[PDB]
């Protein structure tokens, strides 16, 4: 009986922060149910688990078969191999197994993702590793042809854009989420039909903020990247928002707020705040329309 106003085109429940446990150390019980009660209080309506190799679809598999009963939130989830991770295509039996569980769990999939190429992280796959990885992945559309893309880029898009056309990807919906580059790449990416995701990391500059106000409405969607990415003090788009909570210490932990640095779910109002204020939308017209864009796009009827 909640409002249906958000989706979450990509939050990071699997991360290690969500089970309580921040760089090795137990914090604080898996609060997950909290994290899903304050999305619901903020009228998130579906949040798409991102998942980006087998241990995280894993993860996220159970997630949803142990909080789905606990919430109205539609918890679902991607299946790929993250171009990081790309090297674990290499273990023999690792993409059967995958594949395996991908079909076993066919309902809760929503998306090809997360994959790409990412040219500032090779030091686990490289660039060949990456390129020969995402290649390999191409047996998803293949055998889920009506799946739409979450695709990762970073400092590859010339690279990406090619191996779309090359796998036949062109012509498919999809998205490049947690956008980041030039003008030029925005209208590159909008012209191989594609939509744009923005998270935090997207809103961090001025020179960020005049490219994202730039982004047709009926080709946007938001996202939280969560526990990464939230708007810093720091931050360019931060001008916008009025009086944001930053929560408490990881050691003054409170059920009932904020962890600090770890960002939500419910954190995704802060992107529509700022969005719809750089591209002088009204607020609710824009939240209106995105949620139409991510549900056309990732759950459509």
């Not at 809760?108 to 990456?130: H, M, N, P």
């Not at 970073?154 to 003008?183: A, I, M, P």
């Amino acid at each position: 009986s909640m409002a249906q106003q958000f989706i979450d085109i990509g939050a990071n429940l699997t991360d290690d922060n969500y089970f309580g446990n921040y760089h090795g150390k137990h914090y604080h019980e898996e609060d997950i149910d909290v994290v899903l009660q304050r999305a619901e209080r903020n009228g998130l309506s579906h949040i798409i688990i991102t998942s980006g190799c087998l241990n995280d679809f894993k993860k996220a598999i159970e997630i949803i078969n142990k909080y789905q009963n606990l919430t109205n939130i539609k918890l679902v989830t991607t299946i790929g191999v993250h171009p990081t991770r790309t090297n674990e295509l290499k273990q023999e039996g690792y993409l059967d197994e995958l594949l395996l569980l991908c079909e076993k769990n066919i309902d809760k999939v929503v998306a090809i993702g997360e994959i790409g190429l990412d040219y500032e992280r090779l030091q686990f796959s490289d660039k060949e590793t990456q390129l020969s990885g995402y290649r390999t992945l191409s047996i998803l559309h293949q055998k889920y042809p009506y799946l739409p893309f979450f695709f990762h880029c970073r400092k590859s898009w010339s690279d990406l854009c090619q191996l779309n056309k090359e796998l036949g990807y062109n012509g498919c919906k999809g998205v490049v989420h947690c956008f980041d580059g030039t003008e030029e790449e925005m209208n590159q990416i909008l012209n191989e039909g594609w939509d744009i995701g923005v998270t935090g990391n997207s809103l961090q500059s001025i020179e960020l903020l005049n490219v994202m106000k730039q982004i047709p409405i009926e080709r946007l969607h938001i996202e939280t990247d969560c526990p990464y990415c939230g708007i810093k003090k720091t931050s360019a788009g931060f001008k916008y928002l009025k009086e944001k909570d930053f929560g408490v210490k990881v050691e003054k932990y409170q059920r009932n707020k904020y962890v600090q640095r770890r960002n939500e779910p419910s954190n995704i109002i802060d992107i529509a705040i700022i969005m719809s204020s750089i591209k002088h939308i009204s607020l609710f017209e824009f939240v209106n329309k995105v949620y139409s864009n991510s549900m056309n796009m990732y759950f459509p009827t």
